[PDB]
Amino acid sequence: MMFLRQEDFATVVRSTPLVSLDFIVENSRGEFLLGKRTNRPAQGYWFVPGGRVQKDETLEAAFERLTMAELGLRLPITAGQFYGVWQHFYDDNFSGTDFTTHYVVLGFRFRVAEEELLLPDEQHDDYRWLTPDALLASENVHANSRVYF
Amino acid sequence: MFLRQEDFATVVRSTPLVSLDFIVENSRGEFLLGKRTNRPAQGYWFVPGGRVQKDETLEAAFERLTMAELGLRLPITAGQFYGVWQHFYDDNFSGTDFTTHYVVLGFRFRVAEEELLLPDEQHDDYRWLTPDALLASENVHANSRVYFN
Numbered sequence: 001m002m003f004l005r006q007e008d009f010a011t012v013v014r015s016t017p018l019v020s021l022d023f024i025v026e027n028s029r030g031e032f033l034l035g036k037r038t039n040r041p042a043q044g045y046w047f048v049p050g051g052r053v054q055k056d057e058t059l060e061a062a063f064e065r066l067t068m069a070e071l072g073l074r075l076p077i078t079a080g081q082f083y084g085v086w087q088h089f090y091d092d093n094f095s096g097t098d099f100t101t102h103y104v105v106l107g108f109r110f111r112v113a114e115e116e117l118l119l120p121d122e123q124h125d126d127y128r129w130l131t132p133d134a135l136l137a138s139e140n141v142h143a144n145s146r147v148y149f
Numbered sequence: 150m151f152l153r154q155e156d157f158a159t160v161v162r163s164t165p166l167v168s169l170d171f172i173v174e175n176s177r178g179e180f181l182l183g184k185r186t187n188r189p190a191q192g193y194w195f196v197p198g199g200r201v202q203k204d205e206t207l208e209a210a211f212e213r214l215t216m217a218e219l220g221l222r223l224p225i226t227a228g229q230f231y232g233v234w235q236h237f238y239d240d241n242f243s244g245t246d247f248t249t250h251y252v253v254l255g256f257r258f259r260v261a262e263e264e265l266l267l268p269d270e271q272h273d274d275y276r277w278l279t280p281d282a283l284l285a286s287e288n289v290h291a292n293s294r295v296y297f298n
């Protein structure tokens with residue numbers, strides 16, 4: 001009912017906007033975390049960690065599930081600074097190139113201690129901590145992440 | 150993308166809707182509520198608002214929805230962003246067999262009553278209510294009352 005069967009997720013992505021939380025994650029030196037995405041959309045691009053909110057899931061609960069899933073560290077929504085509403089449009093989707101993906105995105109910024117994360121490998125094949133100037137200069141960082149800086 | 154009934158049902162069953170709610174003020178410090186004829190929140194006084202469609206920008210949705218809800222097209226620049234809210238209902242647009250979930254973007258703006266053309270498709274009556282009056286009535290849905298808390 002929350003994590004959908006692929007068939008139902010496909011209908012959802014084809015038919016309506018997804019709602020996601022994007023995390024602008026700072027370290028103690030003022031650098032920010034980007035992961036190199038292994039899944040579509042934005043496959044192969046460096047992107048901020050984040051993910052979609054599920055059916056009947058509160059934003060408070062989603063924030064905890066997603067920080068744990070993306071960073072290996074569960075944080076409460078009270079730790080985040082609301083960072084605006086954004087919109088991400090991609091010509092492809094998780095399953096291929098047959099339809100587009102649309103996210104309405106809630107940004108949240110917060111600082112962590114790098115040593116306390118347990119970065120997972122399911123959705124990203126590499127992670128880097130970059131300065132705003134550095135990430136803004138690279139076309140390998142997706143435009144939808146660059147705009148946060 | 151106005152979905153056929155089958156796919157709207159699958160969408161509502163499976164994922165949050167994204168909507169814009171309008172906190173609309175007149176020249177008397179009163180706010181517009183309509184008595185809803187559709188589920189969810191059927192039969193309650195509620196602020197005007199509606200869902201964002203697939204591949205529709207928030208800017209375009211604001212124009213479409215102000216026109217559809219108020220009879221007057223307004224650009225998103227007319228609205229003052231008024232938070233992210235979450236509405237959970239035990240019923241849905243076509244029955245009582247599954248729940249509806251909205252992630253909601255609120256917008257506040259003032260209008261001249263004589264410039265609106267209030268439609269009758271989704272509401273059977275409209276009133277401009279003071280915060281005190283709307284807070285004192287259980288016929289105003291809790292999800293609208295909280296905008297004035």
Ligand SMILES: Nc1nc2c(ncn2[C@@H]2O[C@H](COP(=O)(O)OP(=O)(O)O[C@H]3O[C@H](CO)[C@@H](O)[C@H](O)[C@@H]3O)[C@@H](O)[C@H]2O)c(=O)[nH]1
Nearest residue numbers: 003004005006009020039041042047049050051052088094
């Ligand atoms: N079967 C199934 N798969 C799902 C579901 N929800 C997500 N997935 C898949 O599970 C993986 C993790 O999904 P998320 O972490 O929720 O979303 P995401 O696609 O990483 O979203 C992030 O990246 C986008 C593209 O860069 C961003 O635009 C977005 O805001 C967010 O940061 C992805 O492979 C996604 O396709 C579901 O209900 N069912």
Ligand SMILES: Nc1nc2c(ncn2[C@@H]2O[C@H](COP(=O)(O)OP(=O)(O)O[C@H]3O[C@H](CO)[C@@H](O)[C@H](O)[C@@H]3O)[C@@H](O)[C@H]2O)c(=O)[nH]1
Nearest residue numbers: 151152153154157168187189190195197198199200236242
């Ligand atoms: N078939 C179909 N029907 C749709 C679709 N989108 C909306 N509808 C239906 O078309 C009508 C108008 O839709 P909206 O204005 O988008 O939604 P809503 O029912 O008004 O939602 C508003 O009220 C909720 C309950 O009070 C609020 O919680 C919400 O934020 C918003 O103000 C409603 O009968 C709704 O069920 C679609 O893609 N396909």
Ligand SMILES: [Ca+2]
Nearest residue numbers: 049050051123
């Ligand atoms: Ca993710």
Ligand SMILES: [Ca+2]
Nearest residue numbers: 197198199271
């Ligand atoms: Ca409506």
